[PDB]
């Protein structure tokens, strides 16, 4: 039994392991929604507008998830300021603040998100009010300091209130620009949704079959108003590709206003009057593209804003697919 000093390494491994087990219990419950497109000059922008108009967004609950990020930003800023105070040898305008500074390092164990008693707030307001701290801060151009330092410190009252809801500028500054996950985690019927807006079209399949598989749902955006036949052939090839045999295809027929005008003035024969025959014909041309599977369960919706018959439909489709896939692996069928 060569357990000597080692039965501490073992102890560490089992402690990390309990943690690994706990993260796993939380995970796997996420509903992943993928926004795709961008294979053109502006497709994913149309997708974003479709999300804004028909899928709402920016609720209080999603804003609440940014509290810790705001706090973390605040903390690195205040630590940078404190250390620079120590570095330049600047003394307090009132020697009693030297006790506050000792308290500051002690009270900086209060980094318990959202514990914003009046005492902590007053400690931060008093440190920030000190003349040596202001003196160092206004010379920040001589060292490295986040530009948002003053922005946050002058608005600490609003941000630290427990009902704080981040604004659009707060979110935009949280470094979620470019690409850029494009994320929200709104709550509905006690389900936590995660929606991801990516692109890639006509040929980016190799990267997202390579990473997107086993995902809960695909949101497939189609420009309804869309050598034209080679493009149609390429679309046939991607949509109907054998590597996508076991993936449910959900269709958001988007830009319906433009599609309705275009089919009004530009005949459908370019690709292959009133809406019903042309729409039925498009459905027939698309559904004939499968040719290899018994069914796909496509959920087609005709939509107005988020205050109409749309949210029920999306949550109904997520629920029926999860149920049918739970029965698929219980011996039943």
């Amino acid at each position: 039994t060569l357990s000597a000093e080692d039965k501490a390494a073992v102890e560490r491994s089992k402690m990390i392991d309990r943690n690994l087990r706990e993260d796993g219990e939380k995970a796997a419950r996420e509903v992943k929604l993928l926004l795709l497109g961008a294979g053109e000059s502006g497709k994913s922008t149309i997708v974003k507008q479709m999300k804004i108009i028909h899928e709402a967004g920016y609720s209080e609950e999603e804003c609440k998830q940014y509290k810790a990020v705001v706090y973390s930003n605040t903390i690195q800023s205040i630590i940078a300021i404190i250390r620079a105070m120590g570095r330049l040898k600047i003394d307090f305008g009132d020697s009693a603040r030297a006790d506050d500074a000792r308290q500051l390092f002690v009270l900086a164990g209060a980094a318990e998100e959202g514990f914003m008693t009046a005492e902590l707030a007053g400690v931060i307001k008093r440190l920030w009010k000190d003349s040596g701290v202001q003196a160092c801060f206004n010379r920040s151009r001589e060292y490295q300091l986040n530009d948002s330092a003053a922005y946050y410190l002058n608005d600490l009252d609003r941000i630290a209130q427990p009902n704080y809801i981040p604004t659009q500028q707060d979110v935009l500054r949280t470094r979620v620009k470019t690409t850029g996950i494009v994320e929200t985690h709104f709550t509905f019927k006690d389900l936590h949704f995660k929606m991801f807006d990516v692109g890639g079209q006509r040929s980016e399949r190799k990267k997202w079959i390579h990473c997107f598989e086993g995902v809960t749902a695909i949101i497939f955006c189609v420009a309804l108003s869309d050598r034209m036949h080679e493009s149609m052939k390429l679309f046939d090839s991607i949509c109907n590709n054998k590597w996508f045999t076991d993936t449910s295809i959900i269709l958001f027929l988007n830009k319906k206003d433009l599609f309705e005008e275009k089919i009004k003035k530009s005949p459908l024969t370019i690709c292959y009057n009133t809406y019903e025959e042309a729409a039925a014909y498009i459905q027939c041309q698309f559904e004939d593209l499968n040719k290899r599977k018994d069914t796909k369960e496509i959920y087609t919706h005709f939509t107005c804003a988020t205050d109409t018959k749309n949210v029920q439909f999306v949550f109904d489709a997520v629920t029926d697919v999860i149920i049918k896939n739970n029965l698929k692996d219980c011996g039943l069928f």
Partner: antibody
Framework: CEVQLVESGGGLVKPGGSLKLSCAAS????????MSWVRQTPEKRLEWVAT????????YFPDSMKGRFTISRDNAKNTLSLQMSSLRSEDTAMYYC??????????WGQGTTLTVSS | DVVMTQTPLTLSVTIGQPASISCKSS???????LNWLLQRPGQSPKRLIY???KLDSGVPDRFTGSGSGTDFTLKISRVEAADLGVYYC?????????FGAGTKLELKR
């Protein structure tokens, strides 16, 4: 940040004598910036004098000379004072007062020359 | 309280090639808080280089702070009229002014 510092009071002194060198501070706030004193012999070797904080919270003297030359500061009239004692001929040097420490020694004064001889 | 010494006293270098002043260090107190102070004749000594890359007031830009291991390097392509004078190298991390032998940097004629 143009710092105005005037060193004065140096001159004739006997070995072991006492003197009160002055650094007049103008162009900056006296009690909010740290101060320092340095003295130089003409013979190319430095002799660092003192460093005191913005309000005197931390003051450090060279290991070779701790306790012999003493620094003080008048925050109301904005003047640094240096009391001088136990002098030897080697202390014949010119003195510069500086704002802050060497960590921020941006400007040096003209200095006043104190010569130690009986 | 060990002293940090600049070597050599005078650095005569050829035109164009890098010129190296080596500060041999007393203590491992490392940021890069090493400073070169210069006294020019007829003028009060002035801090020249502080914090490896931060230029002090009135200081030539041709000074380059570098080095390896326990030795530090002040590199100048050509020692010029502003470079003549007594240099002292001191680590700005800890006090007092470490009294080095000083580089009497001037060009040999």
């Amino acid at each position: 940040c143009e710092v105005q510092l005037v060193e004065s009071g140096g001159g004739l002194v006997k070995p072991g004598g006492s003197l009160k060198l002055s650094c007049a501070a103008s162009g900056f706030t006296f009690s909010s910036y740290a101060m320092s004193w340095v003295r130089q012999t003409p013979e190319k070797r430095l002799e660092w004098v003192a460093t005191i904080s913005s309000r005197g919270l931390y003051t450090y003297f060279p290991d070779s000379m701790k306790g012999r030359f003493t620094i003080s500061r008048d925050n109301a009239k904005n003047t640094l004072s240096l009391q001088m004692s136990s002098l030897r001929s080697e202390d014949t040097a010119m003195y510069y007062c500086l704002r802050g420490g060497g960590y921020d020694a941006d400007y040096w004064g003209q200095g006043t020359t104190l010569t130690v001889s009986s | 309280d060990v002293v940090m010494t600049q070597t050599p006293l005078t650095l005569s270098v050829t035109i164009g090639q890098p010129a190296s002043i080596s500060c041999k260090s007393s203590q491992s107190l490392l940021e890069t808080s090493l400073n070169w102070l210069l006294q020019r004749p007829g003028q009060s000594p002035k801090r020249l280089i502080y914090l490896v890359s931060k230029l002090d007031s009135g200081v030539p830009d041709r000074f380059t702070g570098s080095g390896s291991g326990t030795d530090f390097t002040l590199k100048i392509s050509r020692v010029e009229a502003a470079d003549l004078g007594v240099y002292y190298c001191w680590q700005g991390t800890h006090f007092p002014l470490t009294f080095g032998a000083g580089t009497k940097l001037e060009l040999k004629r």
